[PDB]
Amino acid sequence: TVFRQENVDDYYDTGEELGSGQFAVVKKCREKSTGLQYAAKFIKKRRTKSSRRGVSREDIEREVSILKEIQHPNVITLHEVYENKTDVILILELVAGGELFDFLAEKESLTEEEATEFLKQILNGVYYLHSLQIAHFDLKPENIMLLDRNVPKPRIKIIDFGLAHKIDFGNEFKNIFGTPEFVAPEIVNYEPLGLEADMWSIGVITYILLSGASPFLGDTKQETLANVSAVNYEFEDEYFSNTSALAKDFIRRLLVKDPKKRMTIQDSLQHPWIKPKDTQQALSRKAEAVNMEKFKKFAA
Ligand SMILES: [Mg+2]
Ligand SMILES: [N+]
Ligand SMILES: [N+]
Ligand SMILES: [N+]
């Protein structure tokens, strides 16, 4: 695929650094013809096949391909793609409100009802992606962002599609990647991967959102992976005392070893904790709350 070979500085005024990866750095920029602001992401090419100091073109083109396809208020949008001798430059929607979890770490309190509001936004994004047979494969707090911090009802944006894959019928996909405390058992044990791996991560994220504690985090990387494979987790009374049965049932149906037995995204949107069927089922989320003391310690 051919990307724009022109100098990105002819069309954009770049400024401060918004973040960084191992082979990537993000800068805030302004489009000259419109005056509008975007985020420019500079991705290092490896250029030589035997080099370990960059990203392969195969991986870059996969990410761009997926990004070009998606149009949803809850996922990040691609604007333009530039290429030079060393870098591929992605012009992306500017997402300025920071992480969701650092925004929730500044509130006085947070009920289960208020938390499901933000969770639904995430569920809606994933619902969109899975409807296009796209697995994110990197769902974790760092990648759940806010568009704008200073509005009545902040919008959630899912970012970073560098591990995302379009699910191919006819060829199983196996690989070992991602952050250990957020990856599904099938990733750990080098098994076939599908959309069900995203559902596991949602389970992990919900667990942390309600408690501030990570369900599988061990003292070493190897211990963490072991906990995931064994599905060794507990609803410790120190963290889940004021947590409803429905919230736990929601989590318990996502943290399941067998992917076929795991809850799907269309199911999770139908779950009574997300979509209360009747009566005082709504009262469980409406009344009960998150402990903001143990939660402020997580983002810290
Ligand atoms: Mg991306
Ligand atoms: N332009
Ligand atoms: N198989
Ligand atoms: N445990």
From Swiss-Prot:
Coiled coil: none annotated. Belongs to the protein kinase superfamily. CAMK Ser/Thr protein kinase family. DAP kinase subfamily. The autoinhibitory domain sterically blocks the substrate peptide-binding site by making both hydrophobic and electrostatic contacts with the kinase core. Residues 12-274 form the Protein kinase domain. The keyword Lipid biosynthesis does not apply. It comes from the Eukaryota. GO terms for biological process: apoptotic process; apoptotic signaling pathway; cellular response to hydroperoxide; cellular response to type II interferon; defense response to tumor cell; extrinsic apoptotic signaling pathway via death domain receptors; intracellular signal transduction; negative regulation of apoptotic process. The active site is at D138 (proton acceptor). One of its GO terms (molecular function) is calmodulin binding. Induction: Up-regulated following treatment with IFNG/IFN-gamma. Calcium/calmodulin-dependent serine/threonine kinase involved in multiple cellular signaling pathways that trigger cell survival, apoptosis, and autophagy. Regulates both type I apoptotic and type II autophagic cell deaths signal, depending on the cellular setting. The former is caspase-dependent, while the latter is caspase-independent and is characterized by the accumulation of autophagic vesicles. Phosphorylates PIN1 resulting in inhibition of its catalytic activity, nuclear localization, and cellular function. Phosphorylates TPM1, enhancing stress fiber formation in endothelial cells. ATP binds at residues 18-26, 41, 93-95, 99, 160. This is Death-associated protein kinase 1. It comes from Homo sapiens (Human). Interacts with KLHL20. Interacts (via death domain) with MAPK1 and MAPK3. Interacts with MAP1B (via N-terminus). Interacts with PRKD1 in an oxidative stress-regulated manner. Interacts with PIN1, PDCD6, BECN1, TSC2 and STX1A. Interacts (via kinase domain) with DAPK3 (via kinase domain). Interacts with GRINB. Interacts (via death domain) with UNC5B (via death domain). Interacts with UNC5C (via death domain). Ubiquitinated by the BCR(KLHL20) E3 ubiquitin ligase complex, leading to its degradation by the proteasome. Removal of the C-terminal tail of isoform 2 (corresponding to amino acids 296-337 of isoform 2) by proteolytic cleavage stimulates maximally its membrane-blebbing function. The modification Phosphoserine is found at E288. GO terms for cellular component: actin cytoskeleton; cytoplasm; DAPK1-calmodulin complex; glutamatergic synapse; nucleus; plasma membrane; postsynaptic density. Residues 291-300 are annotated as: Autoinhibitory domain. Isoform 2 is expressed in normal intestinal tissue as well as in colorectal carcinomas. Keywords: ANK repeat, Apoptosis, ATP-binding, Calmodulin-binding, Cytoplasm, Cytoskeleton, GTP-binding, Kinase, Nucleotide-binding, Phosphoprotein, Repeat, Serine/threonine-protein kinase, Transferase, Translation regulation, Ubl conjugation.
